[PDB]
Design a protein around this ligand. Sequence first.
Ligand SMILES: O=C(O)[C@@H](CO)O[C@H]1O[C@H](CO)[C@@H](O)[C@H](O)[C@@H]1O
Ligand SMILES: O=[P-]([O-])[O-]
Ligand SMILES: [Cl-]
Ligand SMILES: [Mg+2]
Ligand SMILES: [Mg+2]
Lengths: 252, 252
Amino acid sequence: MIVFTDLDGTLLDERGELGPAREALERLRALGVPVVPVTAKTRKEVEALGLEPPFIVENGGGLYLPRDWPVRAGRPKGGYRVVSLAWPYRKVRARLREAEALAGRPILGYGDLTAEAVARLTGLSREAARRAKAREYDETLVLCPEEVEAVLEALEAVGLEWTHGGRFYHAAKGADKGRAVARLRALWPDPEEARFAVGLGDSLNDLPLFRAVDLAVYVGRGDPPEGVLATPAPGPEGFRYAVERYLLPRLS
Amino acid sequence: MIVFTDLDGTLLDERGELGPAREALERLRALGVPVVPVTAKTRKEVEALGLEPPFIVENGGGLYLPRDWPVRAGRPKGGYRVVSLAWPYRKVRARLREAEALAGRPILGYGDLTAEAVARLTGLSREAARRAKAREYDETLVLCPEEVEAVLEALEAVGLEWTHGGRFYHAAKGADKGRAVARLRALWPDPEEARFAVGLGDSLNDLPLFRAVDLAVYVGRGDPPEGVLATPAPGPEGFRYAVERYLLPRLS
Ligand SMILES: O=C(O)[C@@H](CO)O[C@H]1O[C@H](CO)[C@@H](O)[C@H](O)[C@@H]1O
Ligand SMILES: O=[P-]([O-])[O-]
Ligand SMILES: [Cl-]
Ligand SMILES: [Mg+2]
Ligand SMILES: [Mg+2]
């Protein structure tokens, strides 16, 4: 069993801290069940949470492996090996300029904004904002609600893909959580261990995650996606519940 | 006679240069007629055009005088004395943060954007965009169309004033072209020379300029405001025509 999990809204509280998920995580760790973050966050953000590879960043754009991963894949990015699945950020940003020209209205993303501006928009500290701006694949968009329809069509027109991470729309090409999870599973050292996969999440960017796993659990607010399991409480308390009620009974 | 002149679309042509207006200006110079730029541009932008003081920047937010101006006014700053008529950019930005809280939605402006983003949104080079970002009084806003009215009400609630500059909305407090013109006229060394003021502009947003002068000339497209003279051709062509038709005969 491998547990693939979103970070924001799932494993982290609304303050963005691993506090409440501790018990649940240590439980999984004590039972030697691998937990793999699969997130919209950048590598710098994931590192700042103290999380170690393997992990999947920027909506599946990059798969980070430990340098000594037993299965050789990706290129050394120092201390890590990285499997790049999506276009690099610079190319997404260039293509966004074309979408903007098509749309005839500004399309702003983190790359257009100061760290101070991003901090003010996200509630993050200045330092956290810098790490959120350090993007390698995916762009976080800051869209007018009323312009979303026109903008998304312009993204599609110019060959970009879009998703939503819980609060913001994102633009990328080739970044898919499910594709990244499937790749990581295929690169897993122990085939038996990767044979059964669990996925937890709460946002639109997680539907591809739910489809790439064998057991999907939704810990967001409102109704679960089609035929996906639910929990009585959202976020980390939902994560804890799922571990205790869905996973442990499966590990016996 | 003093000639107060708008820059963009008035003294400057489509390529941001001179042309027909160069000869017109040289002619005014020769007759000893002061020409005073009055512009939405920042002092850094005005300097990049090679323009010497006195001039009025940021829609009347600041009046720049030569350091050795015969009438003592303003605060010394290098080769200038500066009469600040409006709140400083820093205070405007802080009030904008308050307006954001009232409007319950982000209010972004140039201070939140990189020079590259400002360049892209305005069609300027990165270098010119850096100069447009060096703002001392007025903030340029990038507002969602459907959120404008909510934003503008919020701006006013926190004590800001707003204008629409053709492309973007602006926020400031105390920045008015007419007040700046009246101030400069009151600070003119030779009162007789300041008794008759001409104001040339190309926009309806030049109304405050037009009201503060004795002879108003519109060199913009379409109909001029009521009580404002018009020229057959727009831009520098109009500037040249206006100088030939309205001003030159007066000095003879
Ligand atoms: O899309 C979102 O709702 C969140 C979900 O994690 O991701 C963005 O927003 C987060 C901050 O709220 C950043 O940490 C991520 O890097 C990304 O920019
Ligand atoms: O970590 P993000 O996809 O909420
Ligand atoms: Cl101007
Ligand atoms: Mg999420
Ligand atoms: Mg103008």
